[PDB]
Amino acid sequence: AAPTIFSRILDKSLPADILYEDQQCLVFRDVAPQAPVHFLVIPKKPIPRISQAEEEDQQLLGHLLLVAKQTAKAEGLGDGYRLVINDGKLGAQSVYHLHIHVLGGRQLQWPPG
Amino acid sequence: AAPTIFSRILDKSLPADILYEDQQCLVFRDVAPQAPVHFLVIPKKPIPRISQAEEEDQQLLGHLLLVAKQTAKAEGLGDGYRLVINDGKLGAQSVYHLHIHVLGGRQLQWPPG
Numbered sequence: 145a146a147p148t149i150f151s152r153i154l155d156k157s158l159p160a161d162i163l164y165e166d167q168q169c170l171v172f173r174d175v176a177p178q179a180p181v182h183f184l185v186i187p188k189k190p191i192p193r194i195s196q197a198e199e200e201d202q203q204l205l206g207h208l209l210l211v212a213k214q215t216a217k218a219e220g221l222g223d224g225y226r227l228v229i230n231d232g233k234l235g236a237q238s239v240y241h242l243h244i245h246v247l248g249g250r251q252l253q254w255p256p257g
Numbered sequence: 258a259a260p261t262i263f264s265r266i267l268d269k270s271l272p273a274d275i276l277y278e279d280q281q282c283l284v285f286r287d288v289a290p291q292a293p294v295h296f297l298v299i300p301k302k303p304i305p306r307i308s309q310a311e312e313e314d315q316q317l318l319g320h321l322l323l324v325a326k327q328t329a330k331a332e333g334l335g336d337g338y339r340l341v342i343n344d345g346k347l348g349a350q351s352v353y354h355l356h357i358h359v360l361g362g363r364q365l366q367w368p369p370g
């Protein structure tokens with residue numbers, strides 16, 4: 145039944161560098177950054193993976209992408225960035241709580257893994 | 258906005274392998290695939306890049322993520338996949354019309370470019 149590590153970031157049990165918070169979501173820096181700017185946008189609702197989002201999540205999912213781009217701008221990513229959502233094993237999903245990676249501050253390569 | 262190659266996919270002047278279409282969006286296979294399954298989810302509203310989405314796009318943005326995961330399921334991506342949105346030069350955004358890449362059918366690496 146126990147929730148993921150992200151539930152303990154959300155309830156502030158685990159210290160994190162939090163960039164933004166509202167009643168729907170939380171934004172915090174990734175502690176294993178893959179770029180000079182690397183942060184995560186997560187819903188408070190513990191959707192485990194994008195494959196398990198439902199129609200009722202439409203507004204929340206749109207809010208997560210708007211918060212990602214608002215936070216990218218606040219972090220100074222004016223020359224481009226990348227949003228990544230990993231689902232399951234082949235996506236290399238680490239924590240089974242929905243998160244959007246935001247990466248910037250270097251040239252991102254193609255393919256994206 | 259200037260016409261892009263996506264304008265020619267949307268008006269069906271440029272043939273594509275179209276997986277899904279509704280009032281709000283179009284889904285078609287990427288012609289330079291980076292994985293055995295690689296398709297694009299695009300809005301019909303020509304938002305040039307995620308950095309230029311606005312609050313009024315919330316419902317559309319949520320719809321694009323739900324169509325991405327519904328189409329991933331229809332394409333048999335039950336072992337995981339990756340969603341990628343590129344913004345601007347450092348994101349390696351090729352076409353200035355908002356698109357979500359969906360990649361599956363192989364193990365995606367980390368970092369994601």
Ligand SMILES: C[As](C)(=O)[O-]
Nearest residue numbers: 287288289351352
């Ligand atoms: C051919 As493309 C739209 O993945 O840069």
